[PDB]
Every structure is written in C-alpha cells, then in structure tokens.
Amino acid sequence: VNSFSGYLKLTDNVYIKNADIVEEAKKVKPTVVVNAANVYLKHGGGVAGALNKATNNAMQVESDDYIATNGPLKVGGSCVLSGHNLAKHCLHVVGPNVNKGEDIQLLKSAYENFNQHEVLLAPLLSAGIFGADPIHSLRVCVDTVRTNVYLAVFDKNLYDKLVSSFL
Numbered sequence: 638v639n640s641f642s643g644y645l646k647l648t649d650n651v652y653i654k655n656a657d658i659v660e661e662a663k664k665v666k667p668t669v670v671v672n673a674a675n676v677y678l679k680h681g682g683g684v685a686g687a688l689n690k691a692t693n694n695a696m697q698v699e700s701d702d703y704i705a706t707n708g709p710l711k712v713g714g715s716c717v718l719s720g721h722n723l724a725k726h727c728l729h730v731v732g733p734n735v736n737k738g739e740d741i742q743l744l745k746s747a748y749e750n751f752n753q754h755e756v757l758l759a760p761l762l763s764a765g766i767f768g769a770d771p772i773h774s775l776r777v778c779v780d781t782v783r784t785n786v787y788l789a790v791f792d793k794n795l796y797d798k799l800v801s802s803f804l
C-alpha cells in the first residue's frame with residue numbers, strides 16, 4: 638500500500654491523475670519526484686521552473702553545483718539529487734526536446750531511468766513545453782517503465798484525452 642490518492646489505474650504498474658506535479662509532491666512527499674530536466678539543469682519554466690520555484694530556488698543552487706562538478710547530462714539520461722521540501726529525492730530526467738530537434742527515439746531511453754526506482758511521482762516526459770505528443774509519451778511510459786509510476790497530467794483537458802484514448 639502507498640500514499641497516492643485518486644489515481645486511475647491504467648496498467649499493473651502505471652497510474653494517472655489530473656494534478657499539478659508541484660502541488661502533488663507537497664502533499665505526498667514521495668521517495669522520488671521526477672523533474673522534466675534539460676541537460677544543463679536550468680530549471681526556467683515548465684515542470685522544472687515550477688518544481689524549482691516551490692523549493693525557493695534551492696533546486697537550482699544544488700543543480701548549478703552538480704553541473705560545475707560533472708558537466709551536462711545526456712539527452713535520455715538522468716541524475717539523482719535532493720528532493721528538498723518536495724520529496725526525499727528528485728530524479729532529474731532529460732527527455733528529448735522536439736522544439737530543439739532531438740531524436741524522439743530517445744524518449745524510451747529517458748523512461749528507462751525510472752526502472753532504477755521502485756515508486757515514482759512523475760510528469761509525462763517530453764510533454765508540456767518539451768513539445769512531444771503526450772499520447773505518445775504515455776504509450777512509451779507504459780511500454781518501458783516496469784516500476785510503479787504515478788503520473789500527473791497538468792491539463793484537465795489533456796488528462797481526459799489521455800484516459801479516453803488509452804489502449
């Protein structure tokens with residue numbers, strides 16, 4: 638049993654809910670929240686800006702030190718950093734940004750990072766301001782992630798379309 642409430646079950650391991658991922662994390666304090674990161678961990682807007690704002694910029698301060706030591710992530714890669722006031726840990730995952738011309742085949746690699754964690758609260762990778770088709774992102778999630786993932790879809794309209802169209 639876990640703390641996640643009000644999710645629709647899509648598969649054995651994937652659950653979905655209409656919610657702002659920032660609002661959720663504060664209530665549940667999950668072991669892992671996933672950030673929709675970029676390779677520079679520059680959390681300016683979208684999921685990353687909203688998560689970072691909720692940490693009072695502490696996520697950005699920690700991220701800048703990480704990049705100064707380790708250099709940029711890979712597209713499709715990830716790192717584990719603090720969850721600050723939102724979660725125990727934040728898994729920063731880089732999905733391909735279609736609005737930068739990145740290979741959408743990298744979306745599966747991105748979701749493979751989730752399999753290193755037994756339970757996660759996450760957004761749909763490469764969705765929102767990353768520009769991918771969220772219906773596609775949900776299909777790759779279901780076909781790639783084997784661990785227990787609780788997805789948050791910010792747009793009520795999009796949430797209803799994701800559920801209604803789910804095979």
Ligand SMILES: c1cc(-c2ncc[nH]2)ccn1
Nearest residue numbers: 657659683684687765791
């Ligand atoms: C994009 C933005 C957000 C967000 N939460 C609060 C303000 N903006 C959440 C998910 N995707």
